[PDB]
Design a binder for these strands. Sequence first.
RNA 1: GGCGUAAAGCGCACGCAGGCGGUUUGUUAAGUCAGAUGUGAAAUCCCCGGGCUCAACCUGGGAACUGCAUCUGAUACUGGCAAGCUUGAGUCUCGUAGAGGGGGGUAGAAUUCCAGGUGUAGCGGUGAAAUGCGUAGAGAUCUGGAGGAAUACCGGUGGCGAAGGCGGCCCCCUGGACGAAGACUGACGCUCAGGUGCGAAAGCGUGGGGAGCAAACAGGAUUAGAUACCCUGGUAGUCCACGCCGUAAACGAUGUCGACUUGGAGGUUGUGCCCUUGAGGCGUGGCUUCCGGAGCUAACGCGUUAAGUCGACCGCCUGGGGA
Lengths: 88, 224, 129
Amino acid sequence: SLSTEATAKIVSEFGRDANDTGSTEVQVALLTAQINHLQGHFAEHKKDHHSRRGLLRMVSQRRKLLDYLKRKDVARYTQLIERLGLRR
Amino acid sequence: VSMRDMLKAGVHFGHQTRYWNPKMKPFIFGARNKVHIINLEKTVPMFNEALAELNKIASRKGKILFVGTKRAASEAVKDAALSCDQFFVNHRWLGGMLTNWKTVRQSIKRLKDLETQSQDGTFDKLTKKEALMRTRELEKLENSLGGIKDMGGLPDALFVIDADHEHIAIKEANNLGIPVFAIVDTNSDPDGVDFVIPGNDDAIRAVTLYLGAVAATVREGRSQ
Amino acid sequence: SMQDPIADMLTRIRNGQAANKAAVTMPSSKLKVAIANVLKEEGFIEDFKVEGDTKPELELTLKYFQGKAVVESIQRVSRPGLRIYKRKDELPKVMAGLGIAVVSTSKGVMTDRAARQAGLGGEIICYVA
RNA sequence: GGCGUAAAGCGCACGCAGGCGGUUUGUUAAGUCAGAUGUGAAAUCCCCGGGCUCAACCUGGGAACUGCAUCUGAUACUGGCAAGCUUGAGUCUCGUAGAGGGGGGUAGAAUUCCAGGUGUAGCGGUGAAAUGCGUAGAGAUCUGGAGGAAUACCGGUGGCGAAGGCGGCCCCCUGGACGAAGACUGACGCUCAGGUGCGAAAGCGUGGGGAGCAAACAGGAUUAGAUACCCUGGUAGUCCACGCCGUAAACGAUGUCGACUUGGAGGUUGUGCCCUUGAGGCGUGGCUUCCGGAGCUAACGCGUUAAGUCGACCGCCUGGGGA
């Protein structure tokens, strides 16, 4: 998974505090970082279905978090999807 | 009945924690060295109520049937039931002594006829082969039905030791509506009994204490 | 997941009655407290208390008569998958009147005969016989 | 009304539409409820009478027409809206166990083959035989080499994985689960038609590889026959890379999620406490095996890992053949 330092950096830049590790923005950012990191692993290991299942779990969890955020506050949703480079 | 005498007699002791019956949870005080300890504060009032009901049954022209067949409580049950003009089953309980009384009545008649023709009759037509045969049949029939020969009918109350060991007698008494007074240990089933007396039923001094108390109360009931 | 807490309360009561439990505890709620009030005033449970402030815990004291269950039957009628509403002229009577039917009328949660005397209908919460 | 065995749980999972949804406050009055109004043609149905000499029949009045719309109120529940809350659901910290997956390397035992030494008449196989190999030197034994496949002991109603499945050792990449104490977000949840993905073995396509085993095939037996079982060989295949296939008694013949309900003995993996006496005792989680209580079941049996008591959603069944 992500190292401790990368996780701390993401939590700091995406959270309202250094301890706000549960915010929707922090969770979506961590999931996006893990997906982007896994992208390179699966480019080389196209036959790793067992890990791709966890990758798809991460993708679906990020999708549900983004849906909840868009339904809750669309402004933060837009800021997040522009800061992370989403929307296909 | 005295909780000091009870605790000195070994009543509070129970079986190991594995063999316990969860229905005996209200009467269990705790555990020490993986054996259950019966709550004597629960034991003494239930024993007193059972003794009161036994005294009522005795004073109201009743017949008590003392049931216990373990090698620990056989002779004790015999002594207790003979000490108060009562009846006992201190050896194997024949399946159907109560529910099938119309059939064991014939065996009682046979035992009585054999013992009368042996003692008072004194046939002396021995043949030295049918005589020993008849004496062995008489001793078997007496070891089986020696306690209830003078009962006449069904009793009015059963006093059972080791309610788990005597489940057949309890089920028969329940089928016939006879109240059951049973010493229910931590491993026995207290469902089929009317007056459950939670106490140790394996130690000899505990069962002698129970039987002495019951004999005293049924004698005071007999003498009104 | 937990999608019907009222049916959960009824099931807890039924299972505690079948297991000869002295009292049953559960997470509290306004509707649960109203139904427990209706059950207590009708004589199906002994008492009930709500403990806790941030996470209230409702505790019902079950009732027995002859070593037997006082609540013989308790069923959820209106449920999330199928809501059941009745008018005052078609309010149900359980056990031909010996049982009660907890009804949620616009004047609070009450029994079926109380809602009938009040000239009201509403959602049939449960049947208690 | 059902789906363990009688017909019936998709092989497994992710997930859009849909269905359902913890808890508090306020508001609305859409569902819901109450009242009123309008309407609900007549006949028919039903009730009390009347006339046909009775009946059928005719007929007066009533009830009914369980419905729809409108208007006025109620606010408990469901819904909408707004603000919350932490117990459901997730994130972070530190560790733990594991044949979880993908890639590369390597080790030993054994089979087969090639070359050579010793050595001589058998070997192999079977119920018994024969086919087969062998005086061109087999089998046995010893030495060296080649190649492929699978990993003895550990090893275990043991472990991991959604399922299918996963077993030498090492390294690289990587998923999930669990536990301790906290912090964080604040219903973000459950299920899921269609959809997508994974999916034993066999099989197919292309390119390799090929020791052992072995469909087809050949021969020897057995037999009345023997297109078989048995024996001697043996091609595809089994192995690798990449695609396809999408099926299994894909089984727990038992869909997923959540709550509640007496116990006993174990296994495995964390964690806490105590002169730790000890490989100790006492708690507390996760997964797991056997027995068994109430209950349930046609019975067998299931039984806190339910086939018990419930809730949400989905799939499926409607006599046997045809099929």
